[PDB]
CSV table of C-alpha atoms and ligand atoms in Angstrom, one decimal:
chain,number,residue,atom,x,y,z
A,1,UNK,CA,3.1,-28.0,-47.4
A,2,UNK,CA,4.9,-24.9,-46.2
A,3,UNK,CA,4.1,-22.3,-43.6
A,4,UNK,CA,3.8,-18.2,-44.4
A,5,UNK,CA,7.0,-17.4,-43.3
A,6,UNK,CA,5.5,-15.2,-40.1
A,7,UNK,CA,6.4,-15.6,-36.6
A,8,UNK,CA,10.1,-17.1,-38.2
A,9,UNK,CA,11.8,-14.0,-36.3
A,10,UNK,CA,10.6,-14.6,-32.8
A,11,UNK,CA,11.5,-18.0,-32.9
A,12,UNK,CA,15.1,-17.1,-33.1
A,13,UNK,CA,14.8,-14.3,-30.3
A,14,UNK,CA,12.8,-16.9,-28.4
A,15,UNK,CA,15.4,-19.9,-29.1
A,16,UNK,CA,18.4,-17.7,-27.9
A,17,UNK,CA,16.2,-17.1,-24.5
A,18,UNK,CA,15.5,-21.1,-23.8
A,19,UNK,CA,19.3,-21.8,-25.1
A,20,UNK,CA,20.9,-19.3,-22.3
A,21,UNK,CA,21.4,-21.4,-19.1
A,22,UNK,CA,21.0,-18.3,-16.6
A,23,UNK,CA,17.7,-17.3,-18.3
A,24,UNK,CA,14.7,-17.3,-16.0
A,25,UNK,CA,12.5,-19.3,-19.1
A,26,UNK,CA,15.1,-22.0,-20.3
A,27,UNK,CA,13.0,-25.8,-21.0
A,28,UNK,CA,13.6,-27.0,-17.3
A,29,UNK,CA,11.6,-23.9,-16.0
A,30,UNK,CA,8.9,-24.3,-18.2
A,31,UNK,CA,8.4,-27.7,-17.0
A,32,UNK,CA,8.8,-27.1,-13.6
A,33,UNK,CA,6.3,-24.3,-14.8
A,34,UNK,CA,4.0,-27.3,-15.5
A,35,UNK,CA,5.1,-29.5,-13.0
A,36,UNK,CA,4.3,-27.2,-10.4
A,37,UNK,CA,1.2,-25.9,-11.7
A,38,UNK,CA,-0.8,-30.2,-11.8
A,39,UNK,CA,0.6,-30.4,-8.4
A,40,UNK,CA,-1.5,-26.8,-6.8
A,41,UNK,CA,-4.4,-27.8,-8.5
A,42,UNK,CA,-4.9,-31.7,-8.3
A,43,UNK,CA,-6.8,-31.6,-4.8
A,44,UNK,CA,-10.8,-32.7,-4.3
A,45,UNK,CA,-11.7,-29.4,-3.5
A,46,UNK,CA,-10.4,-27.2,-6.3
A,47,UNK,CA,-11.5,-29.9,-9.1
A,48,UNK,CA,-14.8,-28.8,-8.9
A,49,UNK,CA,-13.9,-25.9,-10.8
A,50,UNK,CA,-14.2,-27.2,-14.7
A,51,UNK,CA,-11.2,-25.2,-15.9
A,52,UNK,CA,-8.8,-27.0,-13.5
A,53,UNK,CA,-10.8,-30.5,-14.2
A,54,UNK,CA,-10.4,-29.8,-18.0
A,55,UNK,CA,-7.0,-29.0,-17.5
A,56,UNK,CA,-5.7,-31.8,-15.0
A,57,UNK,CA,-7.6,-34.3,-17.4
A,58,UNK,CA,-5.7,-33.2,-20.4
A,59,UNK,CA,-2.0,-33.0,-18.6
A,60,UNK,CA,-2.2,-35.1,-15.8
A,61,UNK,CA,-0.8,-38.2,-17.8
A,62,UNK,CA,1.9,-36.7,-20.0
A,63,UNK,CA,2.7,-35.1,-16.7
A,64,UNK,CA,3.1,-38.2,-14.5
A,65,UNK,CA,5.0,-39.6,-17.7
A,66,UNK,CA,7.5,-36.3,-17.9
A,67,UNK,CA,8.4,-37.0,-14.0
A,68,UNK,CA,9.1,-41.1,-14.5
A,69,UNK,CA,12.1,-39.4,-17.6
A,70,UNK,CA,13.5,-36.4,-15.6
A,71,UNK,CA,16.1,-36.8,-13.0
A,72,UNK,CA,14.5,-38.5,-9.5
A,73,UNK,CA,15.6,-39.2,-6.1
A,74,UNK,CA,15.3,-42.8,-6.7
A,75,UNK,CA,18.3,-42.5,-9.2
A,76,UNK,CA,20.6,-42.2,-6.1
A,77,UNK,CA,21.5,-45.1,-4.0
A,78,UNK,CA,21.8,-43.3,0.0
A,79,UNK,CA,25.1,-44.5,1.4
A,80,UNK,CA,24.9,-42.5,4.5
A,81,UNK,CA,23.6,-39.0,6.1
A,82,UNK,CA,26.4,-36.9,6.8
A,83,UNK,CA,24.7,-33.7,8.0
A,84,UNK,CA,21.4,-32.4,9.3
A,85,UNK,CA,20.3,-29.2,9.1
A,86,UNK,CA,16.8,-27.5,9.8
A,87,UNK,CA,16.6,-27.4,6.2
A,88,UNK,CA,16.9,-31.1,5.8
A,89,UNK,CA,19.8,-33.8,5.5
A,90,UNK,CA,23.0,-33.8,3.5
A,91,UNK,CA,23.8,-37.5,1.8
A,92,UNK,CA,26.7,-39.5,0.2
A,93,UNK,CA,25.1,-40.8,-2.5
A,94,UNK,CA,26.0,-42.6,-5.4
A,95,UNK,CA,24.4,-42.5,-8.9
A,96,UNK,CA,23.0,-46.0,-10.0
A,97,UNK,CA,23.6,-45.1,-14.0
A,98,UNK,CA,26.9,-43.5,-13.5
A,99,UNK,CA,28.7,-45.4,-10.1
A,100,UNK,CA,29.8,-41.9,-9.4
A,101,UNK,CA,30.0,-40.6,-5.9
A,102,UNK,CA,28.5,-36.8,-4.7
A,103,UNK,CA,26.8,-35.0,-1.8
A,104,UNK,CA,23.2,-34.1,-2.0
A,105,UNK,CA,21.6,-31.3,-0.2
A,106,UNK,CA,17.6,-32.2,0.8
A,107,UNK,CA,15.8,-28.5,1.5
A,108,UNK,CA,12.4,-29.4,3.1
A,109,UNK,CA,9.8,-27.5,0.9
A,110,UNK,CA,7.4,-27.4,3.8
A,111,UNK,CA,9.7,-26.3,6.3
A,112,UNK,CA,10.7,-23.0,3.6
A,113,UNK,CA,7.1,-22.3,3.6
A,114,UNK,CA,5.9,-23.2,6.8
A,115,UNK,CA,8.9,-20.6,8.7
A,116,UNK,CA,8.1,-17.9,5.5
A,117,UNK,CA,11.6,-18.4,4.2
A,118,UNK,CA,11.7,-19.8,0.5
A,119,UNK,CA,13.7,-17.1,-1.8
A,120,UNK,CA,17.3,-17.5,0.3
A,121,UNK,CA,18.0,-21.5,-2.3
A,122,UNK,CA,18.3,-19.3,-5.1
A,123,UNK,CA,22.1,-17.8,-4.0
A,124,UNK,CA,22.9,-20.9,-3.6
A,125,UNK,CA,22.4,-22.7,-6.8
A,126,UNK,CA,23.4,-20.1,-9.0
A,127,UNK,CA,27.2,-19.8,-6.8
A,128,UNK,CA,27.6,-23.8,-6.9
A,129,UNK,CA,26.2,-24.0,-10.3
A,130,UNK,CA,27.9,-20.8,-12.0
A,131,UNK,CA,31.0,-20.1,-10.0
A,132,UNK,CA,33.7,-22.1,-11.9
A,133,UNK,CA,36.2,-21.7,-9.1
A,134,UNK,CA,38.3,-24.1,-7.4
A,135,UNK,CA,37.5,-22.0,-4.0
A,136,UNK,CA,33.4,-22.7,-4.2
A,137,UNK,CA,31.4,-26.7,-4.1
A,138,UNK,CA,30.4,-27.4,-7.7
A,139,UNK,CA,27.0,-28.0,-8.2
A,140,UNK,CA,26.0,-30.4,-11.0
A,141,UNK,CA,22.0,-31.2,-10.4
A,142,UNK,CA,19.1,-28.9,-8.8
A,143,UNK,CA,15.9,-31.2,-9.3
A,144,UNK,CA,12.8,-31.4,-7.1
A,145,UNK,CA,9.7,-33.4,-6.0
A,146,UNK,CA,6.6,-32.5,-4.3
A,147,UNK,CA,8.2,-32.8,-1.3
A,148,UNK,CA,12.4,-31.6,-1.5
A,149,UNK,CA,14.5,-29.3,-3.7
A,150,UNK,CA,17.7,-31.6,-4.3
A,151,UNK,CA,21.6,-30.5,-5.0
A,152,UNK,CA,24.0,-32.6,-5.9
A,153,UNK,CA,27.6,-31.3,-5.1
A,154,UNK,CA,31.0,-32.5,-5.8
A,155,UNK,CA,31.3,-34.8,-2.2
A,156,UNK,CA,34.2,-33.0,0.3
A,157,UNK,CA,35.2,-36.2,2.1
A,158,UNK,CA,38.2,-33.9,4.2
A,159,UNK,CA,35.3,-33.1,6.3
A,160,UNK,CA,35.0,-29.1,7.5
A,161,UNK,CA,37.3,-27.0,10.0
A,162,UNK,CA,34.9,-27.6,13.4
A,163,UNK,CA,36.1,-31.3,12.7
A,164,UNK,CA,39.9,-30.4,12.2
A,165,UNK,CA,40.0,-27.8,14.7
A,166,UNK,CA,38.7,-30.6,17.3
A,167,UNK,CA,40.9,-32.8,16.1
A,168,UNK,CA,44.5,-30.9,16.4
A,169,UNK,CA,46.1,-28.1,18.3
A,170,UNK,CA,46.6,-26.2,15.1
A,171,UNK,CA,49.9,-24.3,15.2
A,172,UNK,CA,50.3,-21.1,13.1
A,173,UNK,CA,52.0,-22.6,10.0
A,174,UNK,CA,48.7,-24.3,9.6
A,175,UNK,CA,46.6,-21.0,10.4
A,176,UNK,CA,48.2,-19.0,8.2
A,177,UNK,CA,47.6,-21.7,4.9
A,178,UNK,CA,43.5,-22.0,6.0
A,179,UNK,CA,43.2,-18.3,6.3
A,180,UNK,CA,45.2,-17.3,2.9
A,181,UNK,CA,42.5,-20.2,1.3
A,182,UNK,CA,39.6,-18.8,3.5
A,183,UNK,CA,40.8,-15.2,2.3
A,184,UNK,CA,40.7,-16.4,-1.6
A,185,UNK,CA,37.6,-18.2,-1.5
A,186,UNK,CA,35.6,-14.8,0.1
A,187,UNK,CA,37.4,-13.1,-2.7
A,188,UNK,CA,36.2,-15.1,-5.4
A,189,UNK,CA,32.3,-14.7,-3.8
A,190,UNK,CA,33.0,-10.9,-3.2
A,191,UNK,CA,34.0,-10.8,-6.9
A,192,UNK,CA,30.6,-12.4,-8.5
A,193,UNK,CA,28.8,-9.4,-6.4
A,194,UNK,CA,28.0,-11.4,-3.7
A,195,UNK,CA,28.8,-11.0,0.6
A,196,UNK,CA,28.3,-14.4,2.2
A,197,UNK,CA,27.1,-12.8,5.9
A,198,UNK,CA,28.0,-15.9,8.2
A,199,UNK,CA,31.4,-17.3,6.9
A,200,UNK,CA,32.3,-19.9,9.7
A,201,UNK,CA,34.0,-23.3,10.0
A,202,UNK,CA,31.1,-25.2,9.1
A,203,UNK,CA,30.8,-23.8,6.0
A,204,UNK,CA,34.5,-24.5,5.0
A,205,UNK,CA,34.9,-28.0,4.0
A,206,UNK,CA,38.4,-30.1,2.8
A,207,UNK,CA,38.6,-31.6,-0.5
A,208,UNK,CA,40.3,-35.3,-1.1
A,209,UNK,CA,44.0,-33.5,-0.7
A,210,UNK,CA,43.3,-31.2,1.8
A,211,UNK,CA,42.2,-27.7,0.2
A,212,UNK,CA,39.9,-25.3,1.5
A,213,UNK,CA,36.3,-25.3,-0.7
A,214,UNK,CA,33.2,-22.9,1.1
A,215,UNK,CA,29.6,-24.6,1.2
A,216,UNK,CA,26.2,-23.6,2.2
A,217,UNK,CA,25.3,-20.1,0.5
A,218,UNK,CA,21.7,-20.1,2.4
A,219,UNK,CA,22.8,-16.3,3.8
A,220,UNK,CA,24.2,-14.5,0.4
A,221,UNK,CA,23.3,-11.4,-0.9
A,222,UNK,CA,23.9,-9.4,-3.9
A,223,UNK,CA,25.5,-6.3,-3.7
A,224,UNK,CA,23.8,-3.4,-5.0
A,225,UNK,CA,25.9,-0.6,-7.6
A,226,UNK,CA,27.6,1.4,-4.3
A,227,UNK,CA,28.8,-2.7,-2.7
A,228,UNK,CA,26.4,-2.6,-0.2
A,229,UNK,CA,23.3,-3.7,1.2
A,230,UNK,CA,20.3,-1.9,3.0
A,231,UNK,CA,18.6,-5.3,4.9
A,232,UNK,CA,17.4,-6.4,8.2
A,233,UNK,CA,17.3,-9.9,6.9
A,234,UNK,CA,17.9,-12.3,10.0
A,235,UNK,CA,20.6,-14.6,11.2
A,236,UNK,CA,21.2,-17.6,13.3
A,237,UNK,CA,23.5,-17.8,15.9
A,238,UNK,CA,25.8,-15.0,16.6
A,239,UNK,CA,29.7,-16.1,17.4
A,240,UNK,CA,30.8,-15.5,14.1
A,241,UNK,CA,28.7,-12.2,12.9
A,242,UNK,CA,30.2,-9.0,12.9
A,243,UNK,CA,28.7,-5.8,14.8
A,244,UNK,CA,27.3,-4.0,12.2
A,245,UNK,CA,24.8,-7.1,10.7
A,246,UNK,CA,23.9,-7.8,14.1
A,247,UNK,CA,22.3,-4.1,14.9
A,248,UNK,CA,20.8,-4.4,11.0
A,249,UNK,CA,18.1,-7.2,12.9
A,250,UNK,CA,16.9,-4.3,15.2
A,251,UNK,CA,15.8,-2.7,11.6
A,252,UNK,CA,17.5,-1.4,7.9
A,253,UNK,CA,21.3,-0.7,8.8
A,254,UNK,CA,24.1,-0.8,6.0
A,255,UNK,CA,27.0,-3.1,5.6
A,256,UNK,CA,29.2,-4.8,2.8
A,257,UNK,CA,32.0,-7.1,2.0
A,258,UNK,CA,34.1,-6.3,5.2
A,259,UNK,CA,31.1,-8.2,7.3
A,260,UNK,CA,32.9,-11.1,5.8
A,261,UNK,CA,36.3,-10.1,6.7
A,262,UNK,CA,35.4,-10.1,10.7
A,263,UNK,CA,34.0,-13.4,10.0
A,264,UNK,CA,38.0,-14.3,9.7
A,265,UNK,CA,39.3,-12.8,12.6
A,266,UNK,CA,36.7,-15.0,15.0
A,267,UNK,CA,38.0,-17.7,12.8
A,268,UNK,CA,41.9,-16.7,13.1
A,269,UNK,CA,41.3,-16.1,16.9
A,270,UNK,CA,39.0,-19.6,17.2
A,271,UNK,CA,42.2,-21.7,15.1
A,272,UNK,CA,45.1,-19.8,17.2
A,273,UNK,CA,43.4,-20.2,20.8
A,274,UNK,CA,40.4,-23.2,20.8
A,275,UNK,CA,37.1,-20.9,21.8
A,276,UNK,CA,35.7,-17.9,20.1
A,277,UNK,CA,36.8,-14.7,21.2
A,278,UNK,CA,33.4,-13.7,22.5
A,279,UNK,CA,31.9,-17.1,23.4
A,280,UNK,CA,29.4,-16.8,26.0
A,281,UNK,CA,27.3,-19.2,27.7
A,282,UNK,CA,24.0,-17.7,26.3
A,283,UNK,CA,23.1,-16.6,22.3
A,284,UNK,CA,22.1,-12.7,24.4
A,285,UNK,CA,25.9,-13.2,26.2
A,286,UNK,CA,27.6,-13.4,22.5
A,287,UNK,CA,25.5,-11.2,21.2
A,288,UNK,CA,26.4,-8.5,24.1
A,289,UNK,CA,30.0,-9.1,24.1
A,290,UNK,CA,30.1,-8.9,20.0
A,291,UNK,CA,28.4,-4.8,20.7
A,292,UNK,CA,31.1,-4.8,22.9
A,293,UNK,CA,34.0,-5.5,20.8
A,294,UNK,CA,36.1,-2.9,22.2
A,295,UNK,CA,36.1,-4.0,25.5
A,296,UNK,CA,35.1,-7.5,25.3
A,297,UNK,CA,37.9,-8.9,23.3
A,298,UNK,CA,41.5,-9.9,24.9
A,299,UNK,CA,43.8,-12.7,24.4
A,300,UNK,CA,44.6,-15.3,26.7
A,301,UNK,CA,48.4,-14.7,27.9
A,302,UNK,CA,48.8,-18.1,28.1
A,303,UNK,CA,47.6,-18.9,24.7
A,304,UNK,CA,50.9,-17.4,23.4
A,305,UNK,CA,50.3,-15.6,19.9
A,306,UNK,CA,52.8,-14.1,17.6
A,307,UNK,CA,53.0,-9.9,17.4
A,308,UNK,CA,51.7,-10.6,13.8
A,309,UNK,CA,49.0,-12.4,14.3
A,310,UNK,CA,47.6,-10.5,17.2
A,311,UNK,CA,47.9,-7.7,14.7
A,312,UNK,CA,45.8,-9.6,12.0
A,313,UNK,CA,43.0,-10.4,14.6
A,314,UNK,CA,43.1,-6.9,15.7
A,315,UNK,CA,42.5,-5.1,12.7
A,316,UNK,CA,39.8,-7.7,11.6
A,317,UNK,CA,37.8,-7.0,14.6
A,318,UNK,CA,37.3,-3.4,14.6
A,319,UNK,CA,34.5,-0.8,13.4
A,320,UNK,CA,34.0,-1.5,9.9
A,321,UNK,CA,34.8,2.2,8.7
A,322,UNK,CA,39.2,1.1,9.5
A,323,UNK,CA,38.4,-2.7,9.2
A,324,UNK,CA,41.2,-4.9,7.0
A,325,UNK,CA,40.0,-5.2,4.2
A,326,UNK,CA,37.9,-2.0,3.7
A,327,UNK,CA,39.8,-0.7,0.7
A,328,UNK,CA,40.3,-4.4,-1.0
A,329,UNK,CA,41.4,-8.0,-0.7
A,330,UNK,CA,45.4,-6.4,-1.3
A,331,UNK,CA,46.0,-5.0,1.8
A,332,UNK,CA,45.1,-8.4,3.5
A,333,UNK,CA,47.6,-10.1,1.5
A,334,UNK,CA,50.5,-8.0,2.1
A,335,UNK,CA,49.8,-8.5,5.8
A,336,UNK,CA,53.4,-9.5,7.5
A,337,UNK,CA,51.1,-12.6,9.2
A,338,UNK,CA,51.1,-14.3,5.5
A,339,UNK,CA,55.2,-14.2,5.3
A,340,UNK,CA,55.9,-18.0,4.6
A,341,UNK,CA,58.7,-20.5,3.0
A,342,UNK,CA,55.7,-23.4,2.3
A,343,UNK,CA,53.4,-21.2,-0.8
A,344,UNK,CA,52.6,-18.0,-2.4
A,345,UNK,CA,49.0,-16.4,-3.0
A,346,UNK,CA,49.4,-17.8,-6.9
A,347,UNK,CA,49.8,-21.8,-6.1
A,348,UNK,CA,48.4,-21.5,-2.4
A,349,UNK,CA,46.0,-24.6,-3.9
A,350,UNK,CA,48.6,-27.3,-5.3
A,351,UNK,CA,50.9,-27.0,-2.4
A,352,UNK,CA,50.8,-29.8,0.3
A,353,UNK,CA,48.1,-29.0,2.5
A,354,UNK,CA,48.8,-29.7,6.6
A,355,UNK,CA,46.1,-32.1,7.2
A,356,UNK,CA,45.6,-34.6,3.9
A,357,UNK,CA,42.9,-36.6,4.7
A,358,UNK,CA,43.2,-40.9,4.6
A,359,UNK,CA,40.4,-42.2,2.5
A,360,UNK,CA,40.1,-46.1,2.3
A,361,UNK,CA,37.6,-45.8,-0.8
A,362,UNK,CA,35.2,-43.2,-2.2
A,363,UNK,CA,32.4,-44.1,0.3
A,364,UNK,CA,34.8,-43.1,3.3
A,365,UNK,CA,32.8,-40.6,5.0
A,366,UNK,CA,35.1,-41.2,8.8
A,367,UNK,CA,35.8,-37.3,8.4
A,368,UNK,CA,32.1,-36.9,9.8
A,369,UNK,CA,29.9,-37.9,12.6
A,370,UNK,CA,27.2,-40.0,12.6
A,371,UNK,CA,24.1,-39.3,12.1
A,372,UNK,CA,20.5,-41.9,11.7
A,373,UNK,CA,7.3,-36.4,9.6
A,374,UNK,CA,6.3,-33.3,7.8
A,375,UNK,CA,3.6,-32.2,5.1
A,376,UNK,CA,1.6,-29.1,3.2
A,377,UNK,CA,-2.1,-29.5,4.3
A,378,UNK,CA,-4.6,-30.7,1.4
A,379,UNK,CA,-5.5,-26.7,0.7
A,380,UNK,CA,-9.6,-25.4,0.1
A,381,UNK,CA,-8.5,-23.1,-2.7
A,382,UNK,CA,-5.8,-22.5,-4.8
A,383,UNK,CA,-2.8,-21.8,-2.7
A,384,UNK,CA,0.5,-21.9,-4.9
A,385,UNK,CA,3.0,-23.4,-2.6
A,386,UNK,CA,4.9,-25.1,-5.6
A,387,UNK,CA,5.0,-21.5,-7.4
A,388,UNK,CA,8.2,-20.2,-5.4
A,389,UNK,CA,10.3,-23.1,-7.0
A,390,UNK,CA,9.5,-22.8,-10.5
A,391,UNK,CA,13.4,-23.0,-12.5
A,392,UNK,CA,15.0,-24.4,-9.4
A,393,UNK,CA,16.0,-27.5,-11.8
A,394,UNK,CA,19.2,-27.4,-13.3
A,395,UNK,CA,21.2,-30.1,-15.6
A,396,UNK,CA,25.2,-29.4,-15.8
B,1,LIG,C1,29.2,-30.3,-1.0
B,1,LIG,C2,29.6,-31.3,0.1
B,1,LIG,N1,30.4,-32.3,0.0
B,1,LIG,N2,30.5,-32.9,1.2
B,1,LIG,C3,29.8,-32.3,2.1
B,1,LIG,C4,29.2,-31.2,1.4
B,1,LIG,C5,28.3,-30.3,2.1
B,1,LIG,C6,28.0,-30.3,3.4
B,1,LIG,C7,27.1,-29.3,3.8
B,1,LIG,N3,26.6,-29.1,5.1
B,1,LIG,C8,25.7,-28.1,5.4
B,1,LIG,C9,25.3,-27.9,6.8
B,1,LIG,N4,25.4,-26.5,7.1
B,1,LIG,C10,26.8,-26.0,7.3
B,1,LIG,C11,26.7,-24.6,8.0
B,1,LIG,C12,25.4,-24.8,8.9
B,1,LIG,C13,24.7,-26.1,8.4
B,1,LIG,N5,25.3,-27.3,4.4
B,1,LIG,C14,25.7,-27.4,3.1
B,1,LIG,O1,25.4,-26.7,2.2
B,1,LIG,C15,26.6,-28.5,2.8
B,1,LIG,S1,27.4,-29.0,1.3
């Protein structure tokens, strides 16, 4: 009893589309497509509109039954919270099936929505899932419920660099190692068309042996054809943010990858000396000194600093039109600062690290602090707020 033979040569065209795992229509998507579409619908209110009644009758079940087989929260035992953002928490977790240990990111769908701010998750997953590097945090699931967009994340138990820099007087032997892996990692971002925009040391987090891995991707852009952007997409909090992003909030200015290269200097300066180079006691005093750059910045003479490294600092925190790193990734590199006996920029990565953390098992989370409401009203009409997250789920 065989079909006609028609249609045959857009199932192939349409097979290679759902087969692609960077397609925006692969079989996750089109059940989050369905997923999404039971939840906006199945209120009082709207079901007295017989389409949507017909409809929820006939996939509400199969529905229900779909989200019992896919990947779930309650798959993950919760071994501790070891960050909270605005967003929501970070966990340790540990995988019932499996025994196997990761961090996963909770992003508050409400709170997205609520503060107009739901497109900036997609950066995110597509670095961690699709960067392949040994500088970036792996993802290996995206899955979500009504309530939470989940990532699970290879688990960083070295902690990040506002932890070590607490922790130890870091000499510049040490400086110089964080800063080449800081300076690789940006690279690798810079490469996939991306500029991060707030690169600080909470966002730089330490492997089991010690090496440098950047996290949280909430502020990346893509890079248009020239390697810019034209944006006056906010920020948070200034300390790290170079001059010319911070005048883009007062309305459309320009800047590319050399944003990201200030973003080291404050970070060079922070490691070398133990504040910011333009901390202030106010977010307006930061923000004033930053304009200010000129001016604003000078070095302790008691901190004591190198000639070479005052000369790294210094030609990070300039205009961007002369900044380090301007004309490529090279000239940083062959910066005299860099000179060392301990690694070159080839095998930076499997050389000893300066701080290797001491992990008693693969729960230890003693490289962070401790740490111990919320809804979508029931809508009148159709409102969508599941549509923005439609092929957020991803399976490794
Ligand atoms: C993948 C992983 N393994 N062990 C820990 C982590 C992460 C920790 C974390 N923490 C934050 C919080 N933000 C940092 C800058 C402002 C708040 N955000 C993130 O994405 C991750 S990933």
């Amino acid at each position: 009893s065989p079909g006609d033979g028609a249609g045959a040569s857009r199932q192939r065209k349409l097979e290679a589309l759902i087969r692609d795992p960077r397609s925006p229509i692969n079989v996750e998507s089109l059940l989050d497509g369905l997923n999404s579409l039971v939840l906006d619908l199945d209120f009082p209110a709207l079901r007295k509109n017989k389409n949507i009644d017909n409809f929820l009758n006939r996939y509400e079940k199969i529905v229900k039954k779909i989200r019992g087989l896919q990947m779930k929260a309650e798959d993950y035992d919760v071994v501790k919270v070891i960050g909270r953002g605005a967003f929501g928490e970070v966990q340790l977790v540990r995988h019932k099936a499996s025994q196997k240990v990761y961090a996963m990111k909770l992003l508050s769908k409400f709170e997205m929505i609520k503060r107009s701010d739901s497109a900036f998750f997609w950066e995110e997953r597509d670095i961690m899932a699709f960067a392949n590097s040994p500088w970036v945090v792996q993802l290996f699931y995206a899955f979500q419920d009504d309530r939470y967009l989940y990532m699970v994340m290879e688990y960083m138990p070295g902690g990040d660099l506002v932890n070590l820099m607490s922790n130890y007087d870091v000499p510049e032997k040490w400086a110089k190692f964080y800063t080449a892996e800081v300076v690789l990692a940006l690279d690798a971002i810079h490469s996939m068309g991306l500029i991060h925009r707030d690169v600080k040391p909470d966002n730089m987090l330490l492997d089991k042996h010690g090496h440098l891995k950047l996290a949280d991707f909430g502020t990346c852009m893509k890079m248009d054809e020239t390697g810019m952007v034209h944006c006056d997409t906010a920020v948070g909090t200034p300390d790290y943010i170079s001059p010319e992003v911070l005048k883009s909030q007062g309305g459309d200015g320009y800047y590319g990858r050399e944003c990201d290269w200030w973003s080291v200097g404050v970070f060079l300066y922070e490691m070398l000396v133990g504040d910011t180079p333009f901390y202030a006691d106010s977010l307006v005093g930061t923000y004033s000194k930053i304009m200010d750059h000129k001016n604003s910045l000078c070095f302790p003479e008691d901190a004591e600093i190198s000639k070479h490294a005052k000369n790294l600092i210094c030609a990070f925190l300039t205009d961007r039109e002369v900044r380090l790193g301007r004309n490529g990734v090279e000239e940083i590199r062959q910066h005299p600062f860099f000179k060392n006996d301990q690694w070159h920029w080839d095998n930076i990565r499997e050389t000893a690290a300066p701080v290797v953390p001491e992990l008693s098992s693969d729960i230890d989370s003693s490289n962070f602090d401790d740490i111990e409401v919320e809804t979508f009203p029931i809508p009148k009409a159709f409102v969508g707020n599941q549509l923005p997250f439609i092929g957020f789920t991803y399976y490794r």
